[model samples]
Target: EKLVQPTPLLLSLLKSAGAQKETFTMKEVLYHLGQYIMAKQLYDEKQQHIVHCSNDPLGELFGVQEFSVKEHRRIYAMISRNLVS
Candidate 1:
């Protein structure tokens, strides 16, 4: 099984989401990310498709203040690098 192990950065998020595991599959990681997004209400008040990454954790994770629906896909690209394939 080719699992993607989380780096310390990813582990922090995992711990916050209560999904701390030694490793995770691609989709599993995505699942946790989704949880954090929802739990933190990352979406803008009026723009549901937009994610506000100007705060801690997410900002530290994505290195961006905010991203729109059209640009949010980059989160995957950014997340992938923080994991070990």
Candidate 2:
């Protein structure tokens, strides 16, 4: 019972990223996906998902950056490569 397997739709979305000539930013990925998903525990106990300042630890760890638009942020990931930086 592999309940956590990736669906064809999800795989298709991820594959689209690979076709990009430029690296896909987290903001772009989320936009293509049409929704955001977050772990409940990752939500701050007091602030929810609203990061208040530029020095958020989680953001730093995940290479997340803010965009001009409110609620738009970016993170980086590698899907196809065997090695990642």
Candidate 3:
């Protein structure tokens, strides 16, 4: 039997996000792609999820973003209208 793999489009996005690096975090990937929806979809296609903590499986899989917790939180907060006016 053959093993399935991530699609070419996903791999291309990963490479574009600098996944070639020994460590490429979600923040860097998002910045490189410049679109949260695109990055989110790519991660989902890869069977991963963008997380706010270093302990998440996706964080370990794609390298953790040590400095992006606040930024990501703020971004999502805005998307979900959770921020105080």
Candidate 4:
């Protein structure tokens, strides 16, 4: 039997985190988020759900609706600060 899925509440959180407009489905968003999170750890099933970073904006941005005003600013700082330069 297939397990049930959760409601789409996480989609809103993904949108709020600046996901591209093209990613409208929860599975698509979750897949991309999962990739971004798991890539750093090389997709080890044993460590599938545990991600760590010395400084991880992507992780911090996940499910961030509950952040306080100051926390939001910190999150925004992380998002706006590009690392590819």
Candidate 5:
């Protein structure tokens, strides 16, 4: 049994992060999802995982959501019709 199967929920949930279109594919998304869920070590954290950075939008010039948020810092997935760039 897999910890996190390939479900639309996973893909749909990710949309809140980026401003991309809709839908989620297979294979290309699995690895991306696997790494994110794995690298986090079983996945256990808060709720705000936005990528564009929404902390009052003080500085959107050189401030990275991953670094400033201290989470997007680690976890990469770039595939599946421009999955996670």
Candidate 6:
């Protein structure tokens, strides 16, 4: 049997589910993503903080003042999709 590539819609839904199931905070998810970035020498923890912190403006525009697990997972999944093999 050959492996099948997941469609974007299915991948998105699965990612949504993964995000909703996570118990960690958005900061924690960012921290984890930061770890991966740091491991890859792509960015430092401080840089990650600055980058994510800048997202606050967009969050405020969307009426999201804080991070939730659901959002965390979604964002992390997107980042992971690019960062991971």
Best-fitting candidate, measured by lDDT?
A: 1
Candidate 3, 1-77: lDDT as tens digits: 22223334433555655556423344454454444335554333232444442543334343444223336665443
**Model 4 CA lDDT for position 34:** 53
lDDT of 1 by residue, 13-75 (tens): 877887868698877887887788788888756875788878768778777787764654686
Better of 1 and 2 by lDDT: 1
State, as a TM-score between 0 and 1, how close model 4 is to the true structure. 0.35
True-structure Cα RMSD, model 5: 13.0
Q: For candidate 5, give the lDDT of residue 9.
A: 40
Off by over 4 Å in 6: 1-22, 44-85
Per-model CA lDDT versus the true structure:
0.77, 0.34, 0.40, 0.41, 0.35, 0.38
Candidate with the larger lDDT of 3 and 4: 4
- Per-structure clash totals for the candidates: 0, 0, 0, 0, 0, 0
Best by TM-score: 1
Clashes of 4: 0
Candidate 4 least-lDDT 10 residues: 1-10
Which residue pairs show collisions in model 2? none
RMSD of 1: 2.2
TM-score ranking, best first: 1, 4, 6, 5, 3, 2
TM-score of each candidate? 0.80, 0.21, 0.23, 0.35, 0.26, 0.27
lDDT agreement of model 6 with the native: 0.38
lDDT for model 1 comes to 0.77
Using TM-score as the measure, name the better of candidate 3 and candidate 5: 5
Question: Higher lDDT: candidate 1 or 4?
Answer: 1
